[model samples]
Target chain A: KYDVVIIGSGPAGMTAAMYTARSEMKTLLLERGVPGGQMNNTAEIENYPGYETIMGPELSMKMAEPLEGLGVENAYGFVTGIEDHGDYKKIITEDDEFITKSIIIATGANHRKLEIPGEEEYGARGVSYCAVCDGAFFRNQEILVIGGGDSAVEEALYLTRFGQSVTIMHRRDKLRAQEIIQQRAFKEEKINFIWDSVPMEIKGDDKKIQSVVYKNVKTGEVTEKAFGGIFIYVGLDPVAEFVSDLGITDEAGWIITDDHMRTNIPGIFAVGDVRQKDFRQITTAVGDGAQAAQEAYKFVVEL
Target chain B: KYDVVIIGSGPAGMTAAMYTARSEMKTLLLERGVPGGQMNNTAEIENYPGYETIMGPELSMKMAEPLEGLGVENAYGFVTGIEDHGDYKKIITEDDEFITKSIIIATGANHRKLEIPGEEEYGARGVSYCAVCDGAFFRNQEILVIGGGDSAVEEALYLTRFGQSVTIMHRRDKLRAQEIIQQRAFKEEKINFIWDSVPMEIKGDDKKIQSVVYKNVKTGEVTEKAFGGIFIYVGLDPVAEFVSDLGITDEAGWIITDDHMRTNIPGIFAVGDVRQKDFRQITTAVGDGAQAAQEAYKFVVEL
Candidate 1:
C-alpha cells in the first residue's frame, strides 16, 4: 500500500509529494490532466514569492522535477471515487484501483464563466477570471469587471493598480459586496460602474479582444463598448464531486479543513483552492500542501 | 503613517510585503537583521517546492528582490513594542516610532541551543536542528540525534533515509515521545539508542566534525564517540516577547491566530514560526504571509 496518494498535480499536490517523498514515504501522485492544474492556464505569475516573475507552465515543470529523483511514483489516472475502509482507502480511477494509508485532495477550483459568445474563443487574449494573476498584463488599459459580489468588487479595486480605468458591470442596481468594500470602490476615482446590465457577447478580432456587447436589464438596450480586457468574477466552483460521498465538502463543494488541512475524515486532507478559504493563491496552496504532507507522514507512521 | 507595518523580514514577512505591495498598499517591511531572517542561517533548502535545492541565503535574496520594484518600502528598525490604538497602531522602535493601520508579526522562532562546547563553533558544518532541512547533507554518514521527545525521535526516524546509521542519545532511559512514535523508532533497524546520556561537547576537526563527548547521567561515566554530524531538538522558542503584553500568545509564547492569521486584536495579525502551529517551513510561512496580507487589505479598507 502506498503511504500517501495525492490526487492532483497542482502546486499543492506537487508540493505534498515533495515533502512526503523526501521523508521516505512511499508516495504516489495521481493526475488525469496535464500536471500543474490551473497553472498551465495562467500566462504569467508574479506572486509566488521565489521568482520575480515566472511563466505559469514553466513553474509547473520546476515543481514536478524533484519528485522523480526523490522516489515518488508519478502516475496518470482519472480518479472517480474514494472508498474509505478505515485503516486504508481504495482509490478508484477510470481503469485502476490503489490502496493508500492517506490521501490529499488538491483538485482545485475553476473560475465561473460568463457563458457568453466569444468569451471562450478569446480566453487568453482578453477574457480572464483571476485579476490577481492577469491584472499586470493590462497595464494602463481599460478593463471591464463583470459581477456584483465581493470578489467582483474586491478584485475590481485591486485591478485599479494596473488598469488605466476599471469598470464594473453588474445585472443588479447595487453591488452585493460588503458596505466597507463598496465604500472603497465608490471612493476610488479610477473605478466606474455600469449598473443593471449583463454581458451578451465578447467581440474580438482573430488575434485580440476589441469590444463587448452588453444589455441593460430594464431598458432592453443592447450596447457595445471598447475595453482592453474583461475580468469575470461571477463565482468559483471547486472540483470536488469525485469524493462528495465522503462527506468532506461543504454545501458549495469546498472541502472544509482545519489549519493542518485535515478534513473530518481521519486520514483524508483537503488543500489549495478546493478548500473553503478567504484567500486562494499559489503561495497559500503550497503552504497547505506542506502542512498536509507532514500530517499525512505522522498518520502513516502511527498506522 | 503606513497602511501595513510588517515587523520581520523572514519568508513570511517578505511574502506578505510582496502581495501587499503588488496591491498598491503603502507597505513598510522593517527588520533589524538581514532581510531573510532564519533563511540566512540555513545552508540549503529543498522542501520549499520551487527549486530542487537552493542555498538558503540565495533563496532569501530571491524572495526579497520583487518587493523593491513593486514599491514595498524596506527599512531597518528594532521594534520594541506596539501600542494598539482603536483605529490605528503605534509601533515603537529603538530608534524611532511609526503609525500603521495594521501589523503582521513574522518575527519567527529560534531553536533551543545545546550550549555545549564546539556546538556553536561547528554550527552549520556538522550541527543542525532541522532534520528535514539538513539530513540530505549527511548521506551515508553516521549521525547523532539528541533528545528523546517527539520531534527528536521522529526526526531520527526520518534521518534514517540519508544517514548510514542513526543513533538517538537521550537524558532519560525511556523516550518521552508518544507510544506510536517510540514503537516505530524501536522497529527501525538503522536507528540505535543511547539511554540516560547527555551531550557534554561536540568535538570536531578544524575543517569538519569528528566526534562528540557525552555523559551517562546515572553511571557518572563519560565517553567520546565518533560521528559525522549531530542534530539537536531540545525545544523551540518563539520570537514573540516584544508583543507578549498584547495578550495574543499562548503560555509558551507562540502567538495565537486564526486560519486567516488574525490575532485576537483587530488589525493585528501573526504568521510563520512565531504563530502556534504544528508545521513550520518556508512553504507554510509564505502561505501564512499571503493570507495575512489579504486579510490586512480587507482590514485597512474597512478602516
Candidate 2:
C-alpha cells in the first residue's frame, strides 16, 4: 500500500511526489507517458525560479533530481477509476489496481472535446483531439481544425504535414492567434480557412467519421462537408472526467479545491491546472504540487 | 513612481519581488540588512522540497538569484511608515521615501520586547535577543534568559556556550518546551532555573548591564539579581506597525490577508510571515508570493 498516488507527471504532480517521497512516505507517481506532462510540449520557459531561462522539458527533469535518490517508486499507468473510503483509497488503472491511503489528482488538463455530432461516437476512431499524438494516423486524409487560438492555428499548421488538406473552422472572422501565426495559415496552400463558421454536428457511420454539419455566422447558412478525420482543438478541459462521480468539480468541469488544494472528499486532493484557480503557469503548478503533497501527508498521518 | 515596492526580503517578500519584477514592473526591494529575514537565523531546513537537506542561509540566497538578473532594484533601508492613498501608496523609510502604485507588505517578525524600564535604553549594549547573532559579543559573562517556552529553554542552553552562567526565569514553575529540549536544559550544569518569577525591570549602568529586578509570584516578594547581560526569548511580534494606519492587521498585529495574499485594501498585498494565516513555512510563503504577484499584476492591469 502506498501513502500517496500522484496521478499526473507534470510540475505539480512531480513536486507533490517529491514532497511525499522526501517525507519518507510510500509514494508512487503514475504517468501515462514520459514525465513533464504538458510542459514537454512547451518550447521555452523563463518564469520558474532557479532556472533563469530553460526549456520546459529540461526543467521538468531538473525538478525530479532530488527524488532520484529517494524511495519514491515511479510507475507507468493511466488512471481510470478512483474508489475512496475513509481508511484507504483504491486507484484503478487500465493494467492494474492499487490501494493508496491518499490520492493527489494532479492530472492537469487536455485538449477540449466538442460534444456535438459524432464526436464521442467516433472518438479516436475518426475524431482525434491532439495533432501531435494522432496526426500520423490521418496520413493522406483531409481533416478539420476547430477553434481559433494559438493551439488551433498551430495544430492546423502541424496537421498539414500529415493530412492531405487541413480545413480551419472558426465561428469568428478573425483568428485569435498572433498576427504572425494567422499570416502563416493564410499563406499556406494546403491549409484553407472557413471563417464565421462553427461545427454543429459530426455525422458518421459505424466505421469512422463521414461528414460534418456546420453553420456560417455571417450568412446563417448551414452546410455539411465530408472529411476523412476530425481534429478539434477548441481549448482545454481539466482532465477531470473520472472525477465527475465524486462531485468535486464545478459545472465547467474544473475540480473545485480549497486554498489547501483539498477537494470535498476527505482523503482526495487536486492541484495544478485541474484546480479552479487563477493563473496556470509552471511556477504556480510547482507551488500547488508542494502544497498538495504537504496537505496529503498531514491527512495520511492522521488516518 | 514605481509599479510596486516590496518591503522586507524574506521568502515572501523576495518571491513577491521576484514575481512583480519578472512581470517587468518597476520593482524595488527595501531591506535593512541582507535579505532572508528570519531565514538567515535558521540553522537547518529539511522541509522545503527539491532540497532534501539545506542550510537556511544558503537557500535564502538561492531564492534571490533570479532577481539579480532582473530589473528588481535592491536597496538598503529600514521602512518606518506607510501611507495608503486610494490611488497609490507612499513607502517611508529611515533615510528616504518613495511612491508606489501598489505595495506588498512582506515585513516579517521580530523578537518580542518586554517593554519595561531600561529595555529600550540598554537594547544592544547590555540586552540581547538572538543567541546565534549576539552570543559571541558576551564571552565569559553571565546572562539571564527571560520566558519559559521552547525558545526560552533552548536559547538558555545555547547561551551556556558563551556566558559564564545562564539562568532561566519563568513566570510559571514549568517549562513549556518539548521533553527532549527541556531535559537538556535541566541536565546542563552551567544552566540554572528560577521558577515562579518574572523579570520586572532591567537596571544597568550607562556602560553596560548591572542587575535585573524580578518578582516571585508565589512569595509575593521582589528581588534584584546582578547579571552581565540579558537575553530575551519570549515570543515574536509581527513587524507590521507601519501599516497600523492601514488597519490591515489582525488583533495580534499580523497582517490580515486572504488566500491570494491580498489585504482588504485594493492594490495592496501582504505575504509570508506578516500575513495572518494558519501555517507559515518557506514553501507556503514562496507559494503565496507568486499568487500575490499574479494577483497584483491583474489588479494593476485593471487600474
Candidate 3:
C-alpha cells in the first residue's frame, strides 16, 4: 500500500509529492491531463517568487522535475471515484485501483470559457481569465472585461491599475455585483461599461490581439471595438467529481477544508484551486501543498 | 502614500511585493536586516518546489532581484510602531517613518536555539530546527531530538523516515506532549528516550557534527553520545512586537488572521511564521504572501 496518493499534478499536488516523497513516504501522484494544470494554459507567469518571468509550461516542467528525483510515483489516469475506509482509502481510476493511507486533492478548477470565435486561438496572445495574472501585461492598453457578476466587476476595477481604460462588456443592463462594489467601479474614471452586450469574437493576429467583435443582446446590433486584451470571468468549475461522494465539497463543488487543508474525512486533504478560498495563485497553492504533505505525513505516522 | 507596506522581506513579504508591485501598486518593502528573513539563516533548502536543491542565501538573492525590475521600493529600517488612521496607516521605524494605505506583516519567527557550544557552528551541517526541511539529508544516520513538547516528539517521529534511529532527550522525566502522542512515541521501536537529561554541548568537527554532550538532572551524570544530526524544537518567537498594540496577535504573540490573511485591524495583515499556523515552510509563507497581497489590493481599492 502506498503512503499517500495525490490526485492531480498541479503546483499543489506536485509540491505535495515533493515533500511527502522526500520524507520517504511512498507517494503516488495521479493526473488525468497535463502535469501543470492551469499553468499549462498560462502564457507568461511573473508572480511566482524566484523566477522573474517564465513561460507557464516551462515552469510546469521545472516543478515536475524534483518529483522524479525524490522517488515519487507518477501516473496518468482519470480518477473515477474514491472510497473511504478510515484507516486506508481506495482510489479508483479508469485503468486500476490503488490503496493509500492518505489522500490530497489538487485537481484544480477550470475557468468558464467564452466559447466565441478566436477566443481559443488568442488565448496566450490577448485573452485571459485571471486579471491578476495577466492584467499587468496590458499596461496602458485598452482591456475588455466580459461578464456581469461580482468577479467581472471586481476584476475590471482591479484592471484599472494597469489598463489605459477598462470596459466591462456585460449581457445585462446592470452589474450583478454587490452595491458597494458597483459603486467603486462607477466612481473610477478609468472604468467604462458596455451594457447589454455579449462578445461575438476575440479577433486578433497570431502575435497579438487587435479588436473584439461584440453584439448588443437587446438591440441585436453587432460592433467591433479595438482592444488590447480581454479578461473573461464568467464562472469557475472545480474539478472535484471524482470525490463527489466524499461529502467534502461545497454546493459549488469546490472542496471545503480547514486552514490546515483537512477535509471532513480523516486522513483526506484538499488544496489549490479545487478548495474554496480567495486568491488561487501558484504561490498560494504551493503553500497549501506543503501544508497538506506535512499533515498527511503526521496522519500516516499516527496510523 | 504607498499602496502597501510589507514589513519584512521574507519569502512571504517578497512574494507579496512581487504580486502587488507587478499589478502597479505603489509598494514599499521594509526590512531591518537581510531581505530573505528566515531563509537567510537557513543553510540549504530542498523542499521549496521548483529548485531541487538550493543554498538559502542564493535563493534569497534570486527572490529579491525582481523587486527592482517590478518597481517595488526597498527600504531598510526596524519598524517601531504603527498608527492606524482608518483610511491610512503610519509606520514608525527606528530610523524613519512612512505612510501606507495597507500593511502586510511578514516579519517572520525565530526558532529557539540550544545555546550550547558547537550548536551555531554546525547549523546546516548537522543541526536543524526543521525536520521536514532537513530530514531527508540524514538518511540511515543516528539522530537526536532535543525537547519534550509536541513538536519535538512529533518531529522525532518524522525523522524516523530518514534517520537510522532517533533518540529523544528531555529535561524532564515525562514528555509534555499529549498522552496519545507520548504513547505513539513509546510504541515506536526506532525511538529511544533519555529522561531528566539536558543538552550541555554539541561536539563536532569543522565540517559536520560528531557527538552530543548531555547531562542527567537526577543522576548528576554527564555523557557524550555520537549522532549524525540533531533537531531542536524548544519554541518559536514570532516577530510581532511592533504591532502588539494593534490587538491582532494571539496570546503567544503570533498574529491571528482569517483565511484571507487579514488581521483584526482593517488594512493590516499578517503572513508567514508571524501568523499562527501548523506548518511553517518557505512554500506556505509564499502562499500567505500572495493571499495577503490580493486582499490588500481589494482593501486599497475599496478605500
Candidate 4:
C-alpha cells in the first residue's frame, strides 16, 4: 500500500510523483515501458521553456531523475485494470496489485497509427507522427503526410517551414479542417495536395524513407511515390480502457477532468493527452503534469 | 493599441507571448530590467523538463529568442501603474504609456534579501535563497540558514541531504513554524539551532563564504561563526508595487487571480509568483504562463 499511485511516466506523472514524494508521501510510479511515455519518439523539442533546443528522449530521462532522487519507487508492469475500493483504489498491473489512497491517471494517449505495410519497420528510420518533433530533421527534403483533419492540415503547413515540399495525402476530395486553416494551407506554396488517396505501404532504405505506395480511394488504383519522410496525423487513442469500469470517462473514452486534473471520482485524477482537453502538446502536457501533481499532493495529504 | 500587453519576461510571460503571437495577435512584452525575471538571479536551474542543467540567464535568453523570431515587439520600461479604460486598459510605464485590449501580468515576485553587509556580494557565490534550486551545489558542507519561518525550517530540513550539518539562526527564541515541522526539525540529528540572534555580516574568501557575523538580540553581543554557506528565507515581496494604485492587490500586495489566471478585471490576467498562489515553483509558473496566454489570446481575439 502507498499514499499515491501515479500511472505513467511522462512529464505529468513524473511531476506528480515529484510533488507527492517531496511532500514526504509514499509514491509509486508505474510504467509499462521506459519512463518517458510518448516523449521518447520526439526528436527535437524546442518549444519547452528553459532550453533553446534539446532531444526529447534526453529531456524525458532528465525529468525522471529527480523523482528517483526523492525516493519515489518505480514499478515496471503493464496495468490491467483499476478498481475503486472505497477508501483506496486498487491498481492491478501484470505482476502485482497495489492499493493506494489516491490515483493519478496520466497514462498518456498514443498517436493513431496507419497500419500500412512497412510503416512499423521504418518508424524511427524515416516515419514520424508529430511534425514539430521531426520536421527539423527533414530540412530541405520532400515529405508526405497522411490525413486531412485539422491536425493533419496544420502539421503539413508547419512542415513547409523545413521541408522543400510537403504533399498532404488524404482519402477525401476536400480538407476536413476549418476554413481558416484550409485557407492558410492553400496559401502555402510549399504545401501540395493529393486528394482521394490513402497510404498502403511506406518503403524506406536502411538510412531513410525512400518511397511510399498509396491507393486512390476514388479510382481504386494503386501508385508509388518517392519521398524523403512521412508523417501520420489522423487521430489519437487515449489509454483509458483499463479504467473503463471507473465510470468517469465520456463516450469517446476520454477521462474527463476539471482544470485541476481531478476526475469525477474522488482521489482519482487524469491529465495530458489521456484526459479530455482542448489541446495536446508537450507544453500543455508539462502544464497538466504540474497541476495534477499539485492537486495530488493535496488529495494524498488530506487522506 | 495591441491585442495583448504582457508584463514581465519570465518563463510564464514569455510562454504567454509565444502562444498569443503564434495565433497572429499583435503582442507586446514589457520588462522592467533584463528579459529574464527571477531566473536571471538564479545560478543554475535543473528541474525544467529539458536540459539536465542550464544557467538561469541562458534559459531567459533562449525564451526570448523564440518570441523575437515570431516578430513579437518588446518594450523596455518600468511599469508604474494601470487603469481600466473602458474597452481596453491603460498601462503606464516609466518612459512610455500603451494601450492593449487585454493584459497578462507576469511581474514575478522577489526573494526577500537579508540587509546584512556582504550578503549581496556573496549572492550566487556562497549565499542562496532557494534550497531546491541551489542546495545540490553544497554537498557535505556545513550550511547556515537565517530565519525562523515555515519556509526556513522546511528548507533547512531539505538541505540536510547535501550539508554535513545544518544550523538555523533565528532572531526569536523559538521557531514560528508549525508544530509538526518543529518536531521533525528537532528529531533530525544533523540539524542544530542558534536562537536569539540575527545576521550582522557575511565574510568570505574571494570565491566562497567562510563565516557569518551575528548579534545576540537580547545580550547586545556580536558573535562570528564559520560556515560554508548561508540561506536567507526571511520572506518574499511580490512585484505588485507598481500596480498598487489600481487596487487589484491583496493586503500584502500580491495580485489575485482566478483558476484560469484571470484577474478580478476581465481581459487582465496575472501569473507566476506575482499572483497569489499556494505553491510557487518553476513548474507551477510555467503552467500559469500557459493558462494566462490561452486566456489572453481568447480575450484579445474577442476584442
Candidate 5:
C-alpha cells in the first residue's frame, strides 16, 4: 500500500513522484515499459523551459533522479482498471492488485503509435513527430511523413526547409487536409505524395535510420524506400483505457481536470497529456505535477 | 501596436514573450523597473526546475535571452489600466499608451516593502521576505522578522532551524495569529516579541547589513539594535491596480481565472503571483505563461 500511486513515468509522473516522495509520502510509479513514457519517442526536446536543448530521454532521466534519491519505488505493469472502494482504491493489473489512498494518473498519451516491428526501438535514433523539433536535422536528406490530415501536409511542407525532398504517404488516395494547405504542399518543389500507401515498419542502419516499409492499400503490395526518418502524425491517443469506467474523461477519453488536476472523483486525479487542455508541453506538465502533488497532500491529510 | 502585450517582465511575462514571439506573434513586454521584476529582489532561487540551484538574478536574466533571439520588443513603463475596444484593447501607462489584440498580465506582486532606508540596496545582501528561500544564509546569526500575522510568526519559528535567534517586530503589542500557533511561538526559547514596536528604518554598510531603527508605539521612544539580517513577513501585495476597475479580482484583489489563465474579460488574462491560487511557484508561472500564449493565439487567429 502507498499514499500515492502515480501511473505512468513521464515528466509529469516523475515530477509528481519527486514532490510526494520528498515530502515523505509513500509513492510508487507504475509504467508499462521504460520510465520515459512517450518521451522516448521524441528525438529532441527544446521547449522545456530550463534546458535550451536536450535529448528527450536525457531530460526524462534527469527528472527521475530526485525521486530515486528519495526512494520512491517503480514497477512495470499494464493496469487494467481502477475500482473505487471508499477511502482507498483498488488498482487492477493482470498479475497483481494493490490498494492506495490516492491515485495520480500521469500516464501520458502516445502519438498514435504505428505498431510496426521497428517503430518502438528506433525512436529518437531517427523517428519523430514534431517537424519543428527535428526538421533541421534532415538537412539535404529525404524524409517521409505518414498521414493524410492537415498535420501531415503542414509538416511535409515544413520539412522542405531541410530535406532535399519530402514524401507524404497516405493510406487513402486523397488528402483529408484543407484544400488550401494541400495546394501549398503540392506546389513545393521538394514535396511529393505517395497515395494509397500505409507504412508497415521502420528499418534503421546501425547509425542512421534506413527506410520505411509500407503497404499499398489497394493492391496489397509492399514496398520500401530509403529515407532519413519517418514522421508520424496520425493523432494523439491518451492512455486512459484502464479508467474507462471512471467517468472522468471526455467523449474522446481525455481526462477532464481542473487547474488543481482534480478529477470529479475525490481521490482520482489526472495530469499531463492525459488531461484535456489547449496545450500539452513539458513546462505545463511540470506545473501540473506540482499542483497535483500539493492537492493530493491536502486530500490525504483529511483522510 | 502588437498582437500581444505582456505586462511585467517576470518569469511569467518573459515566458509568455518567449512563446508568443517564437510563434511569430508581434510581442511586446512592458516593465516598470529592471527586466526581472520581483525576481531581482531575491538572492537565490532553487525550486525552479532544471537548475539544482541558481542565483535569482541569473535565472531572471536567463529567461530573457530567448526572447531577445525571438525579437520580442521590451520597454520601460508602469501600466495604469486597460480599456476594452472590441477587437483590440488600449493599454494605458503613465507616459505612453499602446493598443494590442490581447494582453497577458504577469505583473507578479510585491512583498509589502518596508520603504525604509537600505531596504532596497541591501536586498538579497542580508534582507529577505521568504524564510524558506534565504534562511540558510542566516545560520547562527540573529535575524528580525517584521509583522504580527500568522505568516510572520510561522516563518519566524521556521527560521529557528538556522538563525541563532528569531525576533518578531510587530506594530501591535499582541499577535494576530491563531491560538495554537501563538502558544507554540510563546513556548520557543529562541523566539522573542517586541511589543508595540515597529521598524523605522533599516541601516547597513557596504560589506554587510548593520542594524534596524525602531520606535515604540506606546512610549514614542526610538531604539536601535544590531541584527545580522531582516526577514519581512508582511503581506503580499498583487500588482493588480491596472485591472482592478475591470472587477476581475476577488475582494482580496487576486485576479480569478479558469485553468487556461483567462480572466472574466474576453481578451485579458492573468498569471503568476497575481493569480488567486494555492501555490505560487516559478514552474507554475512558466506553465501559466505557455497556456496563456496559446490561448491568445487562438483568440487572434480568428481576428
Candidate 6:
C-alpha cells in the first residue's frame, strides 16, 4: 500500500507529490493523459512567480521534473473512483486497484467550451477561456468577449487594461452581471456592448483570429467583424462528477475541503479547481497542493 | 503615495511585490533587516517545486529578481505601526510614513532560540531549528535534538531518515509527546533519549559543530558529548509585536487570516509564518504570497 495516492498532474497534484515524496512517503501520482492539466493548452503564463514569463507547458514541465526524478511513482491511467476503507482508501483505476493510507484529489476543473465553429482550430492562436493567462499577448489589439454573466463582465473589464478595445457580445438585451459590475463596465470608455447578439461562429485567418460571425437574437441577422482575439467566459465545470457520490461536495458539485485540503471523508483530501475555493489560479492550486501533501504526510505518519 | 506597500520581505511579501509590480501597481517592499525573513537562515530548500536543491539565499534572490526587474521600490526600514485614515491606511515606518490603499504583512516568525552559551556562534553551522529545512544536509551523521514536546519528538523522528542516530535530550524525565508518538519513538531502534538533561553550551569546531555540553537536571552533573549537529525545538515567536494593536493576531500572537489573506483590519493582511497556519513551508509561503497579491488587487480596486 502506498502512503499517499495523488490524482491529477497539475501544479497542485505535482506539488503534493513533491512534498510527500520528499518526506520519504511512498507516493504515487496518477495522470490520465499527461502532466500539466489545463496548463498544457495554455500558450503563455506570466503570473506564476519566480519566472518573469514562460510558456504554460514549460512551467508545468519544470514543476514535474523534480518530482519524477525523486522516484515519485507516476501511474498512467484514469482513476475511476475512490473507495473508503476507514484507515486506508482504495483507488480504482482502469487497469488496477491500489490501496493508500491517504488520497489527495487534485483533479483540476475544466473550462466550459462554447463548442462553436473555429474554436478548436484557433484555440491557441487567438481564442482563450482565461484572460489573465493570455491577456498580455493581445496588448494594443481589439478583442471580442462572449457571455454576459459575472465572469464574462469581470473578465471583459480585466481585458480592457490590455486590449485596445473590448466588445462584449451577449444574446440578451441586458447583461446578467451584478449592478456594481455593470456600472463599472458602463463607465469604462474602452468597453463596448453588443445587445441581443450571439456568436454563431469564430472565424480566424491561417495565422490567427481575424473576425467573428455573430447573429442578432432579436432581428435574426448575422454580422461579421474583425478582431485579434476572442475570449469566451461562459462558465466552468468542475470535474467532480466521478466523486459526486462521495458526499464531500457542495450543491454546486465543487468538493468542499478544509484549509488543510481534508474533505468530509477521512483520508480523502481535495485541492485546486476540483475543490470549492474563491480563486482558481495556478498559484492557488500549487499552494493547495503543498498544504494537502503536508497534511497527507501527517495523516500517514500517524497510521 | 505608493499603490501598494508590503511589510516584510519573505517569500509571500516578495511574491506579492512581483505580482503587483507585474500588474503595473506602484509597489514598494519594506523590510526591517535583510530581505529574506526566515528563509535566509534555512540551509537547504528542496520542497519548493522548481529546483531540486537550492540554498535559502539563492531562493530569496530569485524571488526578488522579478520585483527588481519591474522597478518595484524597496524600502529598508521598520514599520512602527499602522494608522487607519478615513480613505487609506498610513504605515508608520522608522524614518517616514507611507500611505497605501492596501497592505500585506508577511513579517514571518522566528524560531525561539535556546539562548544557551556557544549557540549563537554555531548557528547555521551546527545549531539548527527546522528539521525539514536542514536535516537532509546531515545525512548519516549523529545529531542531538533538544526539547521533548510534540514538535521536538516529531522532528526527531523525521531526522532519523537522514541522521545516523537521534538522541533526544529533554530536561524532564518523561516526554510530553502523545502516547502514539512516544510509542513509535520508543520502538525506533535509532532513536534514544537522555532524560532530565538540559543543554548548557554547544561547542563547535571552526567549521562546524563538534560537541555539546549539558547538565543533568536531576543529578546536577555536567557532561560533554560529541555530535555533528543540534536541532532545537523549544518554540516559535511570531513577529507580530508591532501590529498587536491591530487585533488581527490570535491569542498566540500569530496573525489570523482568511484563505484570501485578509486580516481583521480593513486594509491589513497577513501571510507566511506570521499567520496562524498548520504547516510552515516555503511552498506554502509562496502560495500565500500569490493569494495575498490577488486579494490585495481586488481590495485596492474596490477602494
Best by DockQ: 1
Candidate 6: regions farther than 4 A off:
A115-211, A215-222, A226-235, B116-197, B201-212, B215-222, B226-235
On residues B119-237, what C-alpha lDDT tens digit does candidate 2 reach at each position?
98898788988776787787898889999876788778877989999999999987766444677788999998889998989998788888999999999799999998898978778
In candidate 1, list every pair of residues with a backbone clash.
none
The TM-score obtained for chain B by all candidates, in the order given, is 0.72, 0.81, 0.70, 0.71, 0.70, 0.71
Query: Judged by DockQ relative to the true structure, which candidate is superior, 4 or 6?
Result: 4
Index of the highest-lDDT prediction: 1
lDDT, candidate 5, A146-253, per-residue tens = 898867887788788889899999989878664446777878888988899999889987676898888998999999889997888887888899988988999988
lDDT of model 3, residue B295: 90
In candidate 2 chain B, where is summed lDDT lowest over 10 consecutive residues? B43-52
Between prediction 1 and prediction 4, the one with superior DockQ is: 1
**B122-231: candidate 4 lDDT, tens digit per residue:** 99788998886789889998999889976788789889989999999999998866444677899999999999999999999888899999999999899999999999
RMSD of 4: 7.7
Clash pairs detected, candidate 5: none
- lDDT by residue (B106-219, candidate 3, tens digit) is 999878888899899999799999886789999999999999986788788878888989999999997866444577789999999988999999888889999999999999
Give lDDT per model, in order.
Answer: 0.89, 0.82, 0.88, 0.83, 0.82, 0.84
TM-score of chain A of each: 0.73, 0.73, 0.70, 0.74, 0.70, 0.71
lDDT (10s digit) by residue, model 1, range A18-116:
888866789999999888888876656767888987878899999998889888899999899999999999999999999999999999988888888
Error of 6 at B58 (Å): 1.8
Q: Tens digits of per-residue lDDT for model 4 on A225-303?
A: 8999999987888898898877888898899988788898889988788998756666777777767777876786677
Instruction: Return the lDDT, model 5, position B13.
Output: 87
TM-score of each: 0.77, 0.66, 0.73, 0.72, 0.74, 0.75
lDDT of 6 by residue, B1-303 (tens): 777888989888888787777556778899998777776765566667766667777877777766776667987979888887857889888788899988888888877889988799988798888887789989998999998876688788879999999999999988766444676789999999988999999998788899999999988999999999999987678988878887788898999998778887876778888899868777788789888877777787787
**Candidate 1 wrong stretches, greater than 4 Å:** A115-196, A201-213, A216-221, A224-233, B115-196, B200-213, B216-221, B224-233
In Å, residue B262's CA in model 6 sits off its true spot by 1.8
Give iRMSD, candidate 4.
4.9
